[PDB]
Amino acid sequence: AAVTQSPRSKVAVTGGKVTLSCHQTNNHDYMYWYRQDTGHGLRLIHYSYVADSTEKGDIPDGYKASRPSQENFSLILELASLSQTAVYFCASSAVNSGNTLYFGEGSRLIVVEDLNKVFPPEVAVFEPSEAEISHTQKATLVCLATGFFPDHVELSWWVNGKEVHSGVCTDPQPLKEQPALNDSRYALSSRLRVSATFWQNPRNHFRCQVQFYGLSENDEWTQDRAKPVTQIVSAEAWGRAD
Amino acid sequence: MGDSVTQTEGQVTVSESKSLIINCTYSTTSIAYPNLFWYVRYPGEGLQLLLKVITAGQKGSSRGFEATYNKETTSFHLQKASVQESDSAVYYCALGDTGNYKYVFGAGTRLKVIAHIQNPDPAVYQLRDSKSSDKSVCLFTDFDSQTNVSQSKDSDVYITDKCVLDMRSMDFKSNSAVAWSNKSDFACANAFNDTFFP
Amino acid sequence: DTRPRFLEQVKHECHFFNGTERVRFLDRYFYHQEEYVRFDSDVGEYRAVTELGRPDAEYWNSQKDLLEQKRAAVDTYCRHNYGVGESFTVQRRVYPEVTVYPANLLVCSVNGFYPGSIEVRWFRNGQEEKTGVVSTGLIQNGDWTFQTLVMLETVPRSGEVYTCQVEHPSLTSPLTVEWRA
Amino acid sequence: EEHVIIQAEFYLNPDQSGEFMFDFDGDEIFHVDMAKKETVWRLEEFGRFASFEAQGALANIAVDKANLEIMTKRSNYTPITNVPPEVTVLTNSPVELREPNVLICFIDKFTPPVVNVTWLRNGKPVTTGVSETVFLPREDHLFRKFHYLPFLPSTEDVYDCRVEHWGLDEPLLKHWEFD
C-alpha cells in the first residue's frame, strides 16, 4: 500500500534488459533499491534523497538507477547476468517518519541462459492409506508438484471450494530433482490431514492448487511445447466411504 | 573492521508454545547514534517493521516479541515467551542513523515453527495416486520435534525435511515428511533410516 | 543585480548544564532573521513563534515519528555529540602568552589562550590596582584562541614594580610578568 | 559547566548558496564543502578524533531549499532587508618589526551571508598566505566572519581590509598601520 514495486516476478535471458519499477504514495524523500541474498543478507545498490538525482550504494556494479519524480525509483539492468538473480526490495523513508524504512512486496528475478529451461509443474494428489485411518483415525492427503523451473511456486489446499489451512504442512523449500546441474527442475510436496470421518465422506472435495511463476506475454516462444506462462496447475480427489 | 550486524546464522526451528531468542549484536565505525530495528518477512509477503527502539536502555514490543536496546553490550536480542504458528518468517536485525541514508542489515534468521507433540506415534504409510494407482509415495509422520530426517540414499530417490506448519493453521498440527522414487525395487521400509512400518 | 533575497535558517541547539546532567534541546527555524517555529525539549511539541509558523507547528505535531526523534534528541544527539568531541572541545586547554609593554599607560597583552574564562590582574608594589584599569574584554580570534588587553593608567615612579598576573584553567599556578623603571 | 553546541544551516535564494556548520561556544568545529561533498575541519587535529557523514548535511540542505520556497510564497514574497556589516581589523599578537604576525579582519553583524573581502597593501591587492572562514552564526541571527593575513610588520607598509556587501553604499575600507 505504502510502497509498491513491479513486477513481482520476472524471468529474463542473459544479455537482456530488465527494469524494476517502484512507486510510493507517502511523499517520502528517500528511496532505495536492495538485493536479498540468502547468505549475505540485504545489500544496498542505489539510493536517492532528491528527485532527478541518484547516489550509488555499496554494490552498484551492473545496475543503473533513475529517479524522475519524487514518487518513482527504477532499477535498470542493462545486460542481465546470472549473478543478478535474487529478490530485489525497494524502500522509502523520510525525516518526517524519522527515516524508518518502508519496504515493497519484493521483486523475485530469475535469469537463465536459454529461456527454454522453464517448465510448468505437474501436480498430482495421493489418497490417504487405510493403515493411517485404522491406526490414528486420521487421514493425510499428499500433494506432489514435479518437474518445474524455476522453483518459484506457491502451493495451497482447497476443500469444497474454500481455502483451508488447519492440517496443512508444506515443505520449507523445493528440492532439486537433479542436484548436480545448474538447470535442474524442482519438486515440492505438501500434506493435508483431516479426520477419518471427514475423508470417508464422498461429498467432500479436495483440490491442490499450485501457483507457478514463469514467462509473461511479449516473450518470443518458438518451441513445440506450450509457452510456460505464469499459470495455476491443480489436482483434485474426492472422499471415499470405503 | 567497519559496520556490521551479526545475527543467528541459518535457520532456527522451535515448537509451538515454546520460547524463542534470536541473537543480534552490532559494531559500527561510521554510524553516530544507532536506532535499532527488527524487520520480519512472512512467506510470500515483503518486509515489514516488527519493532524499533530509539534510545539506548529501552525496549520495544509487538505481537509478543520483545527486544532491548543495550548500548553496554551493543546487542538487540529478539525474544518471545510462547511462539505461535503465525511467527514463521525471516527476521532481520538492523540499525540505521536517522540523520542520513545509512542502514546496516544482518544476514537474517529464518524461524520454523513445528508441532509440539507429547504423545508421539512415529510410523510410515503408503499413499496411492488418485489417477494412476501405479505412482506411490511414502509418508513419515507423527514423530516428535526431536526427530531429524536424514536425506540421501540414491540420487533417484527424494526425501523432504520436516514440514513447516501453515502460518494460519489452528488444528491437526503434525510433523511429517515424504519420500518418493521411480525404481520400483524399494518400498517405504527401505526409505529413510522404535516406530511402525506396515 | 538588485534582485531580492530570501533566507532560510535552521539552528539545532544543545544547551549543557553541569556537563551532560541537564540538557535542553532546541529545533529552531528562521525566515530571514525571524524565528517562526521551534521545538523545545522542555515543552515537548513544536510551537509557533510567529503566525507565519502556525502551519508548520500544526503539521509537524501530527508526525508522531518526527516528534519521537525530537523528544529524544537530548540523548541521541546532544549528549551523543558532546561525547564525540569532548577531548578536543570541552577539555581543550591552551596556555596564554603574556607580554607587558608601555603604551603613562602600561599594557598587559594576553594572547592565544583557550578557553575564555580568564582573570588578569595588575599589581603595583605587591598591591592589586583597581583605579585606572580598563580591559578590552574577551576577544575571539576565530581559530579556537582568545586574546585580551588590560591597560593600567599609572604614574611610573623610579623603583616602582608593576606586575601583570594571569589566572587561567590551563595553569596550575598563575603566570606573572614584571615591568620596572 | 555551561556549554552550547549548535548545528547551523542556512539556504539563500536566488544565489542557491547553502551552508552547514557546527558551533561550539562560538567556534567552528567543522563545515561541509557543499561543492566537494566533504567535511572540512576548522583545525586539522579535529579530523584525527572525529568523523562525519556529509550526506546528512546535503539532505538537510535539500530540505531547507524546499522549505524556503514554500516560506517565500507564504510570506507573500517578502524579501530580506540588508544589514550592513561592522568591520574591525586587529592583530592576534602584539606587533614587532619583522616578527611574524597575522592581520585579522572581523566582519560582523550582517545579512544576507554574501561578502567580498580583499586585503590591500599600499593600495595593491595581496593574496600571499591569506585564509578565511565561512559565515558564522550570531545569537541575533545575523552573521560574522574572519579573514586572515600573515605579514611582517614594517613602518613603511599600510594595510586595508576592503569588504563589499549589498547593505553598503560603497565598499567599506578598514585601515591598519604600524603604531
Binding site: - | A32, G99 | D56, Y59 | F49, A50, N60, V63
Partner: peptide
C-alpha cells in the same frame, strides 16, 4: 567518534 545530524523537518 562520529557526529550525528539532527534532521530538518519538511513542511507541507
Amino acid at each position: 567518534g562520529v557526529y550525528a545530524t539532527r534532521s530538518s523537518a519538511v513542511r507541507l
